[PDB]
Amino acid sequence: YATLAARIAISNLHKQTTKQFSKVVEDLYRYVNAATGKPAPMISDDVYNIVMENKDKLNSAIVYDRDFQYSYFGFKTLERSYLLRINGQVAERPQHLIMRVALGIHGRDIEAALETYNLMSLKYFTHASPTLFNAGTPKPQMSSCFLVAMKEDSIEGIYDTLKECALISKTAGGIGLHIHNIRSTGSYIAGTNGTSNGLIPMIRVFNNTARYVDQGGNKAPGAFALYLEPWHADIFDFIDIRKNHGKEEIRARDLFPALWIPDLFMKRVEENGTWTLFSPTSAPGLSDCYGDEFEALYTRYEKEGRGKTIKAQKLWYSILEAQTETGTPFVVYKDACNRKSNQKNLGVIKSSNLCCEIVEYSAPDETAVCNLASVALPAFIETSEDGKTSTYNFKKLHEIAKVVTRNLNRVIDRNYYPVEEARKSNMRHRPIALGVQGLADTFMLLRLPFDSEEARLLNIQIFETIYHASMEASCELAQKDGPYETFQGSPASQGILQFDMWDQKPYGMWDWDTLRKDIMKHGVRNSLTMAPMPTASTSQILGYNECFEPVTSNMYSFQVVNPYLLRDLVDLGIWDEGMKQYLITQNGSIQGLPNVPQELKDLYKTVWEISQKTIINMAADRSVYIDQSHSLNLFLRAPTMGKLTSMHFYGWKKGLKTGMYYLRTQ
């Protein structure tokens, strides 16, 4: 169909752009801001000198054919926010952006540079947007998220923290900020008859700084996620922070509430029992432990009159309300996250990030950071048997995941850190996050319904391979540069890998025993490797479905129909106008369509037609090979208090870390 608008706008772009890469780096580097007279380079000194000392090798390495791998919407995304502009006009071709990104990561290892270039240009993998924006640029802030500790229960602590979010928000990246330690409404303050205002008014300050620190282009999200434990006395308002009605002095519409849930809360809800709310000042230490230690300390404070008791299910019901209307708060299980983190030698983890996938340690003086990349799952499909059936090439997937791991690991050293808390932190533990995109495609291309036994297996299979790969790559790194600073004492140091903490045998596609031997011997370079993220933008750049979720509709959206569906409907000579209309009219749903094979109706279920138990199951299956966590969106058809209840508890009992990211509805 109109894949023809892609080619047009692509070679239009070729016409408005200098072909030779090294000339473009000259242009971008030499740039002066006409309106102001200021020399405003867009390449670093470092990457400039590199390109100049290697210009023939580099220019000739670039294959411009590989520009036509982009769908129309992929390309318009690139154009509109990614390709570097000279004075309003676009100056970078897609190949130049990639080549720049390759250099920004690799520096003088031109061999590494050429390997990344090739693999990216061919669509094997892609790095997260901040890397695509800033690698090879003079303030190269390439990380996607910062996990910030509230420094202290004081105006000074609060305003130091506010300063840090502000300094972070100048640049690319999202912020997860935990606040369990701020005293609740009405608590005593020494030196006044004044009472405390609590969380909400302090939230309104943060929300306001989110709105003010724009102007980083549109590279900042302008939103923070905030993490709270449900025992905090300010909980009812906190969860209603994105509510669309009620008083305005109580809402904070540019921020996301995220719950940090102890298992105790859930038991109490299930047991239909009491829940007690404390101010952190009448209940110290509560966020600084978990599991049993928490259970013991909580129960004691609860017996010692230190707080306020109400019915667990009163809170529970309010949460489901807030979630049904707004899609938030997110739900992340504190204990599951801490019980099963390779970072537990550092102390208690107090939050996740803005997309509920990063599970790293943060403290007033260490603000945890992470660099993300995603693998293009469908690129490892081949027909390779001999005949008609397609298989999945796991060798290449292991090979490619080792490359990404090495990339992400360099990005740590060549990263610009907005705040000293992020450099201190990331240099010590060197966490890393790999993800995937196009899981739904992979299945579709391989003729598998999402809810099949075969899909369940491949899910496990793929993730086993990425995790094995990354730990292998990381361990090779530890052999060249030493383990990361804080590796002694870690579960990985004691031979305990992620699935072990889930008390499971690995699916056994790869030799874990060899790997585990070498890790106890040599260490790893990275405390953490795996955390599948939303890929909202980058999967649009590679033309794939986000992430690891099924299609939302088969009507993608001018509106363009799912190419695999189209393919199949045409090959069955049943694609007419009745088809174009039935699918528009049902929004990319093909069930209940008179003349369509059952094989296709299974294959092209939309996420609303797939059962959430299956969804949670696959999240549980893959989770044992996930160092950190993943952004589990949930989708509900005709939503009810009961259906939502069984979904949290289902994931909760599965041992999940992120029980829910967004709740999406209608």
Ligand X SMILES: Nc1ccn([C@@H]2O[C@H](COP(=O)(O)OP(=O)(O)O)[C@@H](O)[C@H]2O)c(=O)n1
Chain residues binding its own copies by CB under 8 A are 33, 35-36, 38, 40, 85, 138-139, 155-156, 158-160, 162-163, 166-167, 170, 188-197, 201-202, 204-205, 208-209, 211-217, 219
Catalytic position from the list 92, 164, 302, 357 = 357
537 among the known binding-site residues? yes
Q: Does 274 bind Mg ion (CB under 5 A)?
A: no
Residue 380: CA atoms inside 13 Å, Cβ hemisphere, count?
25
Stretch that binds Mg ion, among 68-76, 154-162, 276-284, 403-411 (CB under 5 A): 154-162
Q: What backbone phi and psi angles, to 5 degrees, belong to 274?
A: -85, 145
Shorter beta-carbon distance to ligand ANP: residue 36 or 666? 36
Nearest to 533 by CA among 126, 62, 109: 126
| Footprint (CB under 6 A) of ligand X, residues 211-250 | 219, 221
Interaction partner, residue 534 (ligand ANP, ligand X, its own copies, none; CB < 5-8 Å by kind): ligand X
CB of 535 to ligand X, least distance (A): 4
Q: Does 537 bind ligand X (CB under 6 A)?
A: yes
> Which member of 151, 178, 183, 657 binds ligand ANP (CB under 6 A)?
183
Listed in sequence order, the residues at least 6 apart from 362 whose beta carbon sits closer than 8 Å to its beta carbon are: 147, 148, 149, 178, 349, 350, 351, 368, 425
183 among the known binding-site residues? yes
Q: Does 391 bind ligand ANP (CB under 6 A)?
A: no
Give just the sign of the alpha carbon dihedral 572, 574, 580, 584: negative
Stretch that binds Mg ion, among 151-159, 442-450, 552-560, 638-646 (CB under 5 A): 151-159
470 among the known binding-site residues? no
CB of 355 to ligand X, least distance (A): 5
Report helix, strand or coil for 398: helix
Listed in sequence order, the residues at least 6 apart from 565 whose beta carbon sits closer than 8 Å to its beta carbon are: 554, 590, 600, 604
Interaction partner, residue 208 (Mg ion, its own copies, ligand X, none; CB < 5-8 Å by kind): its own copies
Report helix, strand or coil for 507: coil
Interaction partner, residue 221 (Mg ion, ligand X, its own copies, none; CB < 5-8 Å by kind): ligand X
Shorter beta-carbon distance to its own copies: residue 196 or 326? 196
Interaction partner, residue 355 (Mg ion, ligand ANP, ligand X, none; CB < 5-8 Å by kind): ligand X
Give the DSSP per-residue string, 422-452.
HHHHHHHH---EEEEE-HHHHHHHTT--TTS
Shorter beta-carbon distance to ligand ANP: residue 196 or 658? 196
CB of 298 to ligand X, least distance (A): 32
And the tokens for 470? 């990354």
State the Cα–Cα distance between residues 392 and 478, nearest whole angstrom.
Answer: 30
526 among the known binding-site residues? no
H helices of 141-228, where? 155-169, 199-212
- Asked if 357 is an active-site residue, the reply is yes
CB of 182 to Mg ion, least distance (A): 12
> Which member of 213, 427, 445, 566 binds ligand ANP (CB under 6 A)?
213
Closest chain position to Mg ion (CB): 154
Tell me the pairing of strands 145-149 and 368-370. antiparallel
Stretch that binds ligand ANP, among 182-190, 447-455, 464-472, 488-496 (CB under 6 A): 182-190
Percent of the chain that is helix, strand, coil (3-state, to 5): 45, 10, 45
Per-residue contact flags (x/-) with ligand X for residues 170 to 189, judged by CB under 6 A? --xxx---------------
Q: Does 543 bind ligand X (CB under 6 A)?
A: no
Nearest to 335 by CA among 659, 604, 660, 97: 659
Q: Total binding residues for ligand X by CB under 6 A? A: 18
Nearest to 374 by CA among 445, 431, 433: 433
CA 172 to chain centre: 14
Nearest to 141 by CA among 85, 84, 220: 220
**Cβ proximity of 389 and 450 under 8 Å:** no
> Which member of 351, 409, 538, 612 binds ligand X (CB under 6 A)?
538
State the Cα–Cα distance between residues 523 and 483, nearest whole angstrom.
Answer: 5
**Which run of H or E residues covers position 479?**
helix 453-481
Interaction partner, residue 183 (ligand ANP, Mg ion, ligand X, none; CB < 5-8 Å by kind): ligand ANP
Interaction partner, residue 138 (ligand ANP, its own copies, Mg ion, none; CB < 5-8 Å by kind): its own copies
Shorter beta-carbon distance to ligand ANP: residue 146 or 556? 146
State the Cα–Cα distance between residues 497 and 382, nearest whole angstrom.
Answer: 31
- Asked if 355 is an active-site residue, the reply is yes
State the Cα–Cα distance between residues 497 and 501, nearest whole angstrom.
Answer: 7
Shorter beta-carbon distance to ligand ANP: residue 165 or 375? 165
Catalytic position from the list 145, 165, 289, 355 = 355
**Cβ proximity of 393 and 561 under 8 Å:** no
153 among the known binding-site residues? yes
Nearest to 171 by CA among 219, 105, 225: 219
Q: Does 552 bind ligand X (CB under 6 A)?
A: no
> Which member of 54, 81, 118, 197 binds ligand ANP (CB under 6 A)?
197
> Which member of 3, 16, 87, 215 binds ligand ANP (CB under 6 A)?
215
Total length of the chain: 666
Strands (DSSP E) found in 107-144: 125-127
> Which member of 342, 351, 490, 535 binds ligand X (CB under 6 A)?
535
Per-residue contact flags (x/-) with ligand ANP for residues 216 to 255, judged by CB under 6 A? x---------------------------------------
Helix/strand/coil (H/E/C) assignment for every residue in 139-157: CCCCCCEEEEECCCCCHHH
Give the DSSP per-residue string, 483-500.
--TT-TTSTTTTT--HHH
Nearest to 258 by CA among 185, 206, 334: 334
Which residues does the annotation place in the binding site for GDP?
Answer: 129, 144, 353, 357, 535-538
Binding site for ligand ANP (CB under 6 A): 153-156, 158, 170, 182-183, 189-191, 196-197, 213-216
Binding site for Mg ion (CB under 5 A): 154
Which residues does the annotation place in the binding site?
Answer: 129, 144, 153-155, 170, 183, 190-191, 353, 357, 535-538
Looking at the annotation, which residues are catalytic?
A: 353, 355, 357
Binding site for ligand X (CB under 6 A): 128-130, 144-145, 172-174, 219, 221, 354-355, 533-538
Which residues does the annotation place in the binding site for dTTP?
Answer: 153-155, 170, 183, 190-191
